[PDB]
């Protein structure tokens, strides 16, 4: 049994995309199907349904007049179409269905989609060192770092020493600023006496944009 | 809609507790409740449905119960793999989810090693200054992170950011950041980050003078 989706991406706030939802395992063409969405960081809310034969179709009072739920059971696929997307439309969507039918509980669920709305341009980061110190020692221990800042959209990965340094690394969550641009920082903590010694150079890319930069940060 | 609200929002446990969340429904929806298990970057997992029937292949030792508004799920013996956020749902009517409740490793307290990262000149040039403030390995997750210039609280200037448990050794780290213009920043002079943690007995303060 598996529901697969795509469709999702960066969308201006006004503008539409389609999901998708290829079911397979199971006969499709019987069951309720569901569109779930769950916002960055929150917990879980329907947002449209539809009846097997793909007869009655039912909303949320959010997404009402603005989302359409439909089906094509020749091609075992589920679709929302979302027209006039507003930025509180930024989620996960995942399709859902009850397999069991008695169980009257989402047993099946896809792996996800996520659907970005936002009037911000795709930017490429700049990168600035987080550099070691007396500041950034305590005991043996130097911390040092990147910041990875300004960005759009998400994702960005970031290594050190490429890959031959993973240990002490913490790569932390991206912040939204009220820019609508992403910000995040890398660091690794190492010992004072490996700098240096030794070379750090983290490794961020960026692959929304075709940027890819390998920052130096030094002591 | 129904609403449903559960209790714990987060609680600690260790590998081989008993722990139990409870949940309760605006109204009377009888045995119509589901449990489902989250992990991060995962969708949802079925867990119990009909209050008291356990999914599929869910182990023997998860075990729902409660009947009209009041109903708790149980782990009898809690494994590494059960660290998870749990949320609760009415399927009496339309459906309607709890808020949820994160389950996280307990282990002993570890306060935070802090560490003040000035703006690099790299950065400056650009016309825009991002102090950093990094408290690396801590447990519990609970600490606060106030930001400080001329000894003047910062408000609404600074953004924080959490890791997983580290899995490893099951502590937590914070990276806040500072953002100001070059201007407030060439503009004032004692830049400090101020952390509150129940592993320092008072509030320990990183600072540096600019220049």
């Known amino acids: 049994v598996q529901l697969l989706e795509s469709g999702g991406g960066l969308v201006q706030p006004g503008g539409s995309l389609r999901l998708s939802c290829a079911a397979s395992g199971f006969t499709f063409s019987r069951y309720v199907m569901w569109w779930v969405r769950q916002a960055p960081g929150k917990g879980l809310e329907w947002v449209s349904?539809?009846?097997?034969?793909?007869?009655?179709?039912y909303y949320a009072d959010s997404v009402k007049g603005r989302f359409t739920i439909s089906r094509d059971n020749s091609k075992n696929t589920l679709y929302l179409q979302m027209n006039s997307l507003r930025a509180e439309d930024t989620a996960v969507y995942y399709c859902?269905?009850?397999?069991?039918?008695?169980?009257?509980?989402?047993?099946?669920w896809g792996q996800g989609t996520m659907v970005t709305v936002s009037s911000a341009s795709t930017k490429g980061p700049s990168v600035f060192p987080l550099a070691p110190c007396s500041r950034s020692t305590s005991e043996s221990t130097a911390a040092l770092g990147c910041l990875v800042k300004d960005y759009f959209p998400e994702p960005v990965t970031v290594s050190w020493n490429s890959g031959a340094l993973t240990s002490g690394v913490h790569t932390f969550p991206a912040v939204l600023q009220s820019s609508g641009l992403y910000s995040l920082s890398s660091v690794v903590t190492v010992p004072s006496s490996s700098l240096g010694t030794k070379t750090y150079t983290c490794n961020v890319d960026h692959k929304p944009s075709n940027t890819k930069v390998d920052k130096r940060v030094e002591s | 809609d129904i609403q449903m609200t559960q209790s714990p929002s987060s609680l600690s446990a260790s590998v081989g507790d008993r722990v139990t969340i409870t949940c309760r429904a605006s109204?009377?929806?009888?045995?119509?409740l589901n449990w489902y298990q989250q992990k991060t970057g995962k969708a949802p997992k079925a867990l119990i449905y009909?209050?008291?029937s356990l999914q599929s292949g869910v182990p023997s030792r998860f075990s729902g119960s409660g009947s009209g508004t009041d109903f708790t799920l149980t782990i009898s013996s809690l494994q590494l793999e059960d660290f998870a956020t749990y949320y609760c749902?009415?399927?009496?009517?339309?459906?309607?989810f709890g808020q949820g409740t994160k389950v996280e490793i307990k282990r002993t307290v570890a306060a935070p090693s802090v560490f003040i990262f000035p703006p690099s000149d790299e950065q400056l040039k650009s016309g825009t200054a991002s102090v950093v403030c990094l408290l690396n390995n801590f447990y519990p997750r609970e600490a606060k992170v106030q930001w400080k210039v001329d000894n003047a609280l910062q408000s609404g200037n600074s953004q924080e950011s959490v890791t997983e448990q580290d899995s490893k050794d099951s502590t937590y780290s914070l990276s806040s950041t500072l953002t100001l213009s070059k201007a407030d920043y060439e503009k004032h002079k004692v830049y400090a980050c101020e952390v509150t943690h129940q592993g320092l007995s008072s509030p320990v303060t990183k600072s540096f003078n600019r220049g």
């Open positions: 859902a269905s009850s397999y069991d039918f008695w169980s009257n509980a989402f047993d099946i």
């Open positions: 349904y539809i009846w097997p034969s793909g007869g009655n179709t």
């Open positions: 109204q009377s929806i009888g045995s119509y």
């Open positions: 009909a209050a008291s």
């Open positions: 749902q009415q399927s009496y009517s339309t459906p309607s």
